[PDB]
Amino acid sequence: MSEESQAFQRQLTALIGYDVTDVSNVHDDELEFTRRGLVTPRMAEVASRDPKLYAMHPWVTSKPLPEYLWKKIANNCIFIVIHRSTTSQTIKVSPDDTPGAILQSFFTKMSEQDFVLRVCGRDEYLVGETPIKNFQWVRHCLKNGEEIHVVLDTPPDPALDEVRKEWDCDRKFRVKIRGIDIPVLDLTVFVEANIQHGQQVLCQRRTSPKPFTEEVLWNVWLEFSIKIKDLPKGALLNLQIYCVRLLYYVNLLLIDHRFLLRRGEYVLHMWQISSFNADKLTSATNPDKENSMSISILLDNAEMPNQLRKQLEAIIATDPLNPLTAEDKELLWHFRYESLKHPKAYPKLFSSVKWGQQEIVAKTYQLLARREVWDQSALDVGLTMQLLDCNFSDENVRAIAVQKLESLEDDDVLHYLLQLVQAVKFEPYHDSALARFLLKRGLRNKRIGHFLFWFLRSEIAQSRHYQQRFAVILEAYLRGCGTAMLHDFTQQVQVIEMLQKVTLDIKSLVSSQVISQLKQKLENLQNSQLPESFRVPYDPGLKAGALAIEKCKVMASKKKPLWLEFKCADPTALSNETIGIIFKHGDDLRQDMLILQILRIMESIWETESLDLCLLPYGCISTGDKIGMIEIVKDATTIAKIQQSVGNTGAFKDEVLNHWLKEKSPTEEKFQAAVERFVYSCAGYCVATFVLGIGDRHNDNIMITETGNLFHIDFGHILERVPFVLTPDFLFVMGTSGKKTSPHFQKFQDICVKAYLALRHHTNLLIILFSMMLMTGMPQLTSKEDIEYIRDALTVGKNEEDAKKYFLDQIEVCRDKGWTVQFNWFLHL
Numbered sequence: 001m002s003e004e005s006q007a008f009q010r011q012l013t014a015l016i017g018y019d020v021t022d023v024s025n026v027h028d029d030e031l032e033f034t035r036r037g038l039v040t041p042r043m044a045e046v047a048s049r050d051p052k053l054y055a056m057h058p059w060v061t062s063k064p065l066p067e068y069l070w071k072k073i074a075n076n077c078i079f080i081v082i083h084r085s086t087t088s089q090t091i092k093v094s095p096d097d098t099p100g101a102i103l104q105s106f107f108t109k110m111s112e113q114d115f116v117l118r119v120c121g122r123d124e125y126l127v128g129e130t131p132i133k134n135f136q137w138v139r140h141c142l143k144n145g146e147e148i149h150v151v152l153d154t155p156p157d158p159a160l161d162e163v164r165k166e167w168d169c170d171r172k173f174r175v176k177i178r179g180i181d182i183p184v185l186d187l188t189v190f191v192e193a194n195i196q197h198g199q200q201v202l203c204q205r206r207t208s209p210k211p212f213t214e215e216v217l218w219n220v221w222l223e224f225s226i227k228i229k230d231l232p233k234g235a236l237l238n239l240q241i242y243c244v245r246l247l248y249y250v251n252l253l254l255i256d257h258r259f260l261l262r263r264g265e266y267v268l269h270m271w272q273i274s275s276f277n278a279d280k281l282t283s284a285t286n287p288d289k290e291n292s293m294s295i296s297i298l299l300d301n302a303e304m305p306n307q308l309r310k311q312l313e314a315i316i317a318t319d320p321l322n323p324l325t326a327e328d329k330e331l332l333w334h335f336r337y338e339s340l341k342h343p344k345a346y347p348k349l350f351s352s353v354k355w356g357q358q359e360i361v362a363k364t365y366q367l368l369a370r371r372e373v374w375d376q377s378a379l380d381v382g383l384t385m386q387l388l389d390c391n392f393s394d395e396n397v398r399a400i401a402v403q404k405l406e407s408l409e410d411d412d413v414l415h416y417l418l419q420l421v422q423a424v425k426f427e428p429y430h431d432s433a434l435a436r437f438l439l440k441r442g443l444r445n446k447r448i449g450h451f452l453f454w455f456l457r458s459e460i461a462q463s464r465h466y467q468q469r470f471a472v473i474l475e476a477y478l479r480g481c482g483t484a485m486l487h488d489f490t491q492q493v494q495v496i497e498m499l500q501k502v503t504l505d506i507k508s509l510v511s512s513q514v515i516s517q518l519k520q521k522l523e524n525l526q527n528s529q530l531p532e533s534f535r536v537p538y539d540p541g542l543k544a545g546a547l548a549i550e551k552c553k554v555m556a557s558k559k560k561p562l563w564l565e566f567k568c569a570d571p572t573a574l575s576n577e578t579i580g581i582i583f584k585h586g587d588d589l590r591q592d593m594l595i596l597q598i599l600r601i602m603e604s605i606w607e608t609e610s611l612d613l614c615l616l617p618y619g620c621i622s623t624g625d626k627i628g629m630i631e632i633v634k635d636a637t638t639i640a641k642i643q644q645s646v647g648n649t650g651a652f653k654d655e656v657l658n659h660w661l662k663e664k665s666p667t668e669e670k671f672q673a674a675v676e677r678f679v680y681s682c683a684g685y686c687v688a689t690f691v692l693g694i695g696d697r698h699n700d701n702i703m704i705t706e707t708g709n710l711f712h713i714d715f716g717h718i719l720e721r722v723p724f725v726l727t728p729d730f731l732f733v734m735g736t737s738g739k740k741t742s743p744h745f746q747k748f749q750d751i752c753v754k755a756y757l758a759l760r761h762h763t764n765l766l767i768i769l770f771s772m773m774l775m776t777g778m779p780q781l782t783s784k785e786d787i788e789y790i791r792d793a794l795t796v797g798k799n800e801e802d803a804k805k806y807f808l809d810q811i812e813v814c815r816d817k818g819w820t821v822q823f824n825w826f827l828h829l
């Protein structure tokens with residue numbers, strides 16, 4: 001169209017944070033070609049969308065209600081409190097009761113159906129043909145022993161979710177290196193050209209060294225061994241510059257999105273370094289044409305023996321990080337069809353394919369066509385993710401992984417959403433099955449869409465390597481989510497943008513001269529700019545309204561984070577506490593997202609085995625670059641603020657925590673409950689942090705609720721080693737003093753092992769989330785050793801006895817250290 005269309009595209013660009021129509025930094029039309037290609041998948045999903053359920057986005061699981069939540073249901077009954085204007089009942093319900101059956105048990109008890117059950121204060125709906133025990137909110141209240149308060153009102157209008165309608169010979173490969181050109185510059189340099197496929201180097205030619213000047217020309221043809229015929233789809237031409245150190249890199253797809261051999265002149269602006277990270281794989285070029293180093297090039301082109309079957313089974317049995325010897329690869333490949341029967345063998349098997357051989361690749365495709373076994377295998381996420389990491393560039397291979405993800409219920413997609421989004425950094429092409437899966441699942445569920453938005457926007461705002469790709473995916477999604485969401489997103493984006501300017505102008509300018517500037521700026525923004533209401537990005541069901549200027553402060557700390565507090569915009573809120581949101585800058589919150597999300601994954605893992613370690617993965621979302629927001633946990637203090645209250649330099653007292661708990665819990669019952677919550681949470685976080693290798697933390701980065709719930713914060717990181725924090729003040733709450741035993745220190749040791757072995761049951765899953773996390777989220781170019789940590793931490797190989805020993809050993813290391821490490825953080829300061 002015109003003024004309205006162009007304004008709609010302007011609408012999107014503002015939401016995205018990047019102009020998808022911009023073509024300044026491309027050398028082909030892949031991005032555009034991807035924008036067009038994504039239209040069909042979008043429209044199909046939109047055209048299959050059930051309006052009523054999409055508008056009400058019920059949050060549901062199929063998983064059996066955990067044992068520890070069953071025990072919290074006495075007479076096979078669950079009480080619900082319905083509200084009408086000023087009305088309240090309390091219908092006893094069966095855990096197997098459908099919502100519709102309950103309203104039926106309501107209007108009989110005391111347009112008829114024109115009503116629906118909405119959670120009080122929240123934008124959450126308990127609807128659809130689902131046992132009332134299988135709603136997430138209902139499982140939430142149960143865990144927190146809360147009353148399920150539900151207001152009865154009218155179903156939301158599906159009209160609000162309306163959508164605004166719209167080569168190749170037998171010649172060997174060769175590349176011409178013209179030269180390099182950097183405006184501004186140990187004094188020698190050479191260009192290395194790698195043919196890469198799935199992180200593997202198929203062939204590698206180098207140039208002669210030359211003096212390192214602002215303009216170095218070679219004008220040389222690099223001849224490779226591999227013929228043009230044997231180039232696999234997805235092969236990257238990896239161009240790098242060494243001085244013996246790696247300075248710059250850039251990649252070019254040898255085969256494009258149209259299956260055309262890429263030929264012609266290219267001047268590629270490179271990224272500079274400052275070895276396994278995902279950024280090294282990007283096909284995008286550096287946008288900063290002014291300063292970036294440039295590169296110029298020209299393209300112009302029976303039965304299986306018993307002992308061997310046991311060899312194979314052994315190989316297949318090893319963990320992902322276990323390297324395959326050439327001997328192992330030949331065995332796996334030669335016995336393709338026997339390996340095919342073992343879904344767990346796939347990752348290794350396809351790591352055994354010579355991708356530089358067209359004939360081998362074809363045989364491989366003939367293997368995948370023998371779908372049966374794979375297709376009928378039970379969904380194994382851990383295994384599936386392995387096929388979607390950096391070791392796999394082949395479309396067909398990666399596609400069968402995605403195919404397996406299709407059978408994930410929404411609840412499960414949420415658990416892995418952040419990782420799957422990140423996993424797009426490993427796709428050779430912009431338009432991939434993985435991208436479409438995310439897009440498809442985002443448009444089908446509002447809650448998944450919401451988090452898809454922020455996960456994508458998070459990367460677009462701070463990752464120049466992938467922002468272009470993520471923007472095209474984000475736009476596609478935005479064009480199908482409906483108007484209601486486009487409007488809500490618009491508010492959230494504005495709020496965070498206004499709260500940005502504020503948190504920025506404060507760090508520069510804790511005095512009351514700032515307490516004055518703060519309250520003055522908030523009042524100004526509130527009176528005029530800040531929207532009436534907006535959704536909490538890390539808790540979308542919750543609507544935050546007006547500001548409580550009186551409550552808003554500015555935390556004292558290295559960085560100057562804003563501590564805000566909003567009034568809920570929902571009148572039917574069965575409470576009147578404010579929403580506390582922290583707005584921080586100066587730290588990349590993405591790493592924290594990844595950690596918190598692996599934390600939630602750990603909880604579910606523990607749920608599949610009827611365990612609850614009371615972790616507390618608070619809300620945390622990167623909203624722009626270097627900034628973001630963090631949920632404020634009510635009734636919570638830092639472990640340090642409780643100690644440094646006897647407040648001194650160093651000097652920790654063993655029973656200040658206990659005093660604090662007792663002081664904060666009114667009854668010996670509520671206190672004893674807090675002491676139990678502490679035992680669990682403490683165990684949960686000791687295991688969780690040991691496994692992830694982030695256990696050695698210090699006081700002020702560990703918090704506790706007044707209900708005795710422990711939880712770590714700020715996985716910045718922020719500034720003798722200890723496996724994890726288990727200080728004498730923790731132990732004292734458990735009754736033990738260095739060193740003996742108590743009913744609760746025995747419970748602790750028990751839980752830890754139960755939880756630890758539980759995690760080890762899913763070794764492969766964690767291993768692969770760990771390695772991915774590091775490759776897509778962590779600063780450093782991670783080496784093989786960093787990742788090899790999870791192997792060791794999970795005692796790979798060893799039995800459940802040697803393992804239990806290993807961990808209880810760790811527990812003792814901490815006990816022997818006491819306050820040593822904590823005291824050191826001061827001493828060193």
Ligand SMILES: CN1CCN(c2ccnc3c2c(/C=C2\Oc4cc(O)cc(O)c4C2=O)cn3C)CC1
Nearest residue numbers: 582584592618620630631632633636638713714715
């Ligand atoms: C003394 N002072 C302690 C912190 N504070 C809280 C008080 C109550 N709850 C809280 C917080 C809090 C804070 C932070 O959480 C983070 C998480 C990250 O990944 C990185 C970070 O830099 C932070 C961070 O600064 C988080 N929650 C859930 C206010 C009071």
